Write a structure and sequence with these properties.
This protein has a single domain, classed as Cytochrome p450 (Orthogonal Bundle), CATH 1.10.630. It has 17 helices and 13 strands. With 432 residues, it is an alpha+beta fold. The protein binds protoporphyrin IX containing FE and ligand YCG. InterPro entries: CYP46A1, Cyt_P450, Cyt_P450_CS, Cyt_P450_E_grp-I, Cyt_P450_sf.
Length: 432
């Protein structure tokens, strides 16, 4: 009743889009456990996301913390909602995301991208159906495992099928809650994931002791954040957090980019030409190469406008506040959605047209209407990691292969924690 005065109704993101267009920039939604208010003006985006006065709503992030009673992300970097506890771990883990840290990861990006293209090239007979969704998730997972944790998962070669199963069941579990044996499959998968964590951490600890060669990475920092903690729960929260966050969205963004580009032959021809000019035949992209893939950068940004895997974020409004002429009561989750704003014609001209030129030099940058990595203090710690890795993978594909989507494959979305292609992006391939 306390929310009844707010405009609202008497893939869910698409329903939210319809509601925002019909009811304006502040709309009550009663889908989540609570009533929340979707705020879609750039004025609100700027006010709430760009200030440390506003923090994440813990009632919303509880669904990441714990799933069917099993600790999943716990109080890790994504799901910790208290500013001070968040800040303490952010500053330590930030060390793994410096320019100097990221530059050293180019080797791993190159090796796994090369392995993926060699695998695809062998199937490029213009006939064999290849799930690009699957191949890209395996590459993303193999990259993350090696880069962040020093482990070789070999999913690209069919290894670690249980591990991929567990991630899949746990993602479905997030959405399920947000019978008998689905609960079992989910619960086990989460424990599996945490048990993997304890394994690698034990391995890392063994290596360090008789001082084997142990290169500084994300794991180094998450360990450092927990130095002198009372047990390993905080450590394993971040293991799982980075295990999942460090591949799932990257994979999704890759899959969506490949899917969309399969109907964009003129953009594909421009991307192929850019890659031919900047890297040529070289089998390795350097760091300075990446910055020269300017058109590719723009394409990837446009892909994230229309297809953000992580569609938005929540903040807690503590005190009753006027928001764009609406009285929003205190103790209210505010939902921000780059998916919704990306598809509104008040913010983007012809919003459904895929146009990389929106992100060209000399184009007015979108002011608070576009945030696929979020904004402010709680923006994506892995944004530059992701940007580098997806560029490497995309550049290698474009260098070497032509993709055609199998007819019958759809362009629609599903929701499994994140947004991802409904279909497996089944393609036939030919060498360039
Ligand atoms: C295209 C790929 C990626 C996208 C679209 C993405 C998107 C996002 C978004 C929207 C948030 C804010 C979440 C919220 O408000 O609840 C976020 C935060 C985060 N992302 Fe990502 N992410 C990507 C890749 C990565 C990678 C590669 C890593 C790690 C290797 C990562 C780790 C995180 C973490 C740990 C946070 C929490 C940051 C904090 O609150 O301090 N993400 N990301
Ligand atoms: C944050 C978010 C908002 C809206 C909808 C979904 C998500 C998720 N992000 N996720 C990540 O792993 C992730 C988080 C941050 N950077 C990269 C990946 C899931 C836990 C899978 C779900």
């Amino acid at each position: 009743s306390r929310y009844e005065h707010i405009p609202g109704p008497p893939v869910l993101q698409d329903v939210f889009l319809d509601w925002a267009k019909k009811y304006g920039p502040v709309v009550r939604v009663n889908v989540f456990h609570k009533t929340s208010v979707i705020v879609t003006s750039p004025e609100s985006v700027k006010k709430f996301l760009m200030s440390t006065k506003y923090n994440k709503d813990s009632k919303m992030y509880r669904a990441l913390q714990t799933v069917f009673g099993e600790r999943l992300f716990g109080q890790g970097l994504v799901s910790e909602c208290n500013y001070e506890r968040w800040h303490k771990q952010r500053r330590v883990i930030d060390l793994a995301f410096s320019r100097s840290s990221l530059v050293s990861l180019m080797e791993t990006f190159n090796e796994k991208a090369e392995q993926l293209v060699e695998i695809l090239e062998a199937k490029a007979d213009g006939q064999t159906p290849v799930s690009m969704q699957d191949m890209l998730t395996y590459t993303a997972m193999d990259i993350l495992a090696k880069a962040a944790f020093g482990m070789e998962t070999s999913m690209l070669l069919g290894a670690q099928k249980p591990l991929s199963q567990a991630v899949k069941l746990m993602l479905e579990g997030i959405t399920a809650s947000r019978k008998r044996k689905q609960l079992r499959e989910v619960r086990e998968s989460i424990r599996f994931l945490r048990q993997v964590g304890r394994d690698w951490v034990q391995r890392r600890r063994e290596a360090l002791k008789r001082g084997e060669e142990v290169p500084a990475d994300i794991l180094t920092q998450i360990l450092k954040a927990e130095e002198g903690a009372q047990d390993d729960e905080g450590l394993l929260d971040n293991f799982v957090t980075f295990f999942i966050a460090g591949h799932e969205t990257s994979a999704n963004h890759l899959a969506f980019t490949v899917m969309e580009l399969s109907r964009q032959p003129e953009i594909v021809a421009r991307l192929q030409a850019e890659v031919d000019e900047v890297i040529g035949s070289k089998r390795y992209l350097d760091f300075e190469d990446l910055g020269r893939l300017q058109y590719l950068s723009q394409v990837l940004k446009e892909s994230l406008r229309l297809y953000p895997p992580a569609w938005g974020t929540f903040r807690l409004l503590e005190e009753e506040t006027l928001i764009d002429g609406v009285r929003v009561p205190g103790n209210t989750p505010l939902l921000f959605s780059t998916y919704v704003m990306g598809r509104m014609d008040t913010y983007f001209e012809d919003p459904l047209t895929f146009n990389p030129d929106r992100f060209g030099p000399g184009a007015p940058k979108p002011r608070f209407t576009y945030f696929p990595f979020s904004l402010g203090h709680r923006s994506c710690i892995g944004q530059q990691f992701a940007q580098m890795e997806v560029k490497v993978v995309m550049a290698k594909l474009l260098q070497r292969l032509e993709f055609r989507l199998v007819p019958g494959q759809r362009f629609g979305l599903q929701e499994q924690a994140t947004l991802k292609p409904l279909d497996p992006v089944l393609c036939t391939l030919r060498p360039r």
